[PDB]
Design a protein around this ligand. Sequence first.
Ligand SMILES: Nc1ncnc2c1ncn2[C@@H]1O[C@H](CSCC[C@H](N)C(=O)O)[C@@H](O)[C@H]1O
Ligand code: NA
Ligand SMILES: [Zn+2]
Ligand SMILES: [Zn+2]
Lengths: 297, 122
Amino acid sequence: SQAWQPGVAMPNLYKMQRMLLEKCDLQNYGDSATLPKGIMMNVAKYTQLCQYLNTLTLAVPYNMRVIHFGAGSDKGVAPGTAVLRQWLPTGTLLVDSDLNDFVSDADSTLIGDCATVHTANKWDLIISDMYDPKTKNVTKENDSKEGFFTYICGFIQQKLALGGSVAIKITEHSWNADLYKLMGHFAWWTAFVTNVNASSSEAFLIGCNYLGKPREQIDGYVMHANYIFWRNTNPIQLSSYSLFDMSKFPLKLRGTAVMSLKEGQINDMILSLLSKGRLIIRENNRVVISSDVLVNN
Amino acid sequence: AFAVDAAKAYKDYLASGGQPITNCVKMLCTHTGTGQAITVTPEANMDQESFGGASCCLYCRCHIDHPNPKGFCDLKGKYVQIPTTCANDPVGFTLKNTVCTVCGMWKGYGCSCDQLREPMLQ
Ligand SMILES: Nc1ncnc2c1ncn2[C@@H]1O[C@H](CSCC[C@H](N)C(=O)O)[C@@H](O)[C@H]1O
Ligand code: NA
Ligand SMILES: [Zn+2]
Ligand SMILES: [Zn+2]
């Protein structure tokens, strides 16, 4: 039934439970979806993520600004970035970044730790596929991780335009309590599992329409335990079916209004427009980005 | 005057029997597109495969300057349509082929600007 969907979003009732953390043990762990001929797993994964994002109230202004973290692959190319550029309207600005060098279709690419990335502007959409290789090779008590996740939390709170959205990749071991707490700063949020990678604990934490303040207090340690409980009790069938119908794939250019309102002008009417994906609040100054360079002999 | 010629070096490498550059990013699409060579979005028809442009550019992939004063790339940030019979070597195809400046189709693989004037159709 869910097999023809691009994936499965965590039902809302899980967000209201208080589950104890334990191992994520997937029943469909030893399966694989039928990937279309010559299609890389990451092209399939991002295609399903974008197919799901099309069903949400994303703000899509003219001159949209998108930043993609963890865009490089061991292949030296950017499969996810190519899918995002295919999905996003033609006039959308796309910047990507990764610790390792790679060739990209993005307007600009920054190489180095995301912690070295700076920008004077606000963004309308943040996509992260960052994952630390040590998380895999080294297993230990499953506590909140504080490497690139601390940067992402700070980037959301200072560089995301109100009304903007995020899609941050997490796994059983690659997660952060502060990031779950920030999901409460969006009009709505969920954990989305792509059907092509349902055999993995991977999921995208999606924050839809940033409000700049908490609409709900979320305990990150409890919410990750709730996420694992959902993955352990509701098996997701591996499926690549949604990849064969790309007729309605492009993100519709809504032409969402962009206004440079002050923090004292954010009333209940504004929060209501932000919550419907009908408003983006940020200045529209020249987009400037940079990557710090450590200098030493 | 010395100048590295990566284009002829890749052609000679293929002529010898060298494996073509891999990991060109193939995109999912309807295969009901215009069939033009380089487009802002995948435009493959039933006889083509669409790929992310930067991954099919010899200069982008080898991390070397582009052969033109401005150092501009015609593939990066766009999608390149490659005939299915040549999709095993997209970098080689973009090198050895030219886009018609009139119809936007590849010369010898879509461009019909040189065919006879079809007895006019009502
Ligand atoms: N602190 C950090 N800053 C930047 N990139 C990081 C990072 N920690 C991990 N990464 C990157 O996260 C990536 C995870 S794999 C990403 C795959 C890519 N999205 C695709 O489309 O195929 C790796 O390339 C790794 O270098
Ligand atoms: Na597009
Ligand atoms: Zn190039
Ligand atoms: Zn022509």
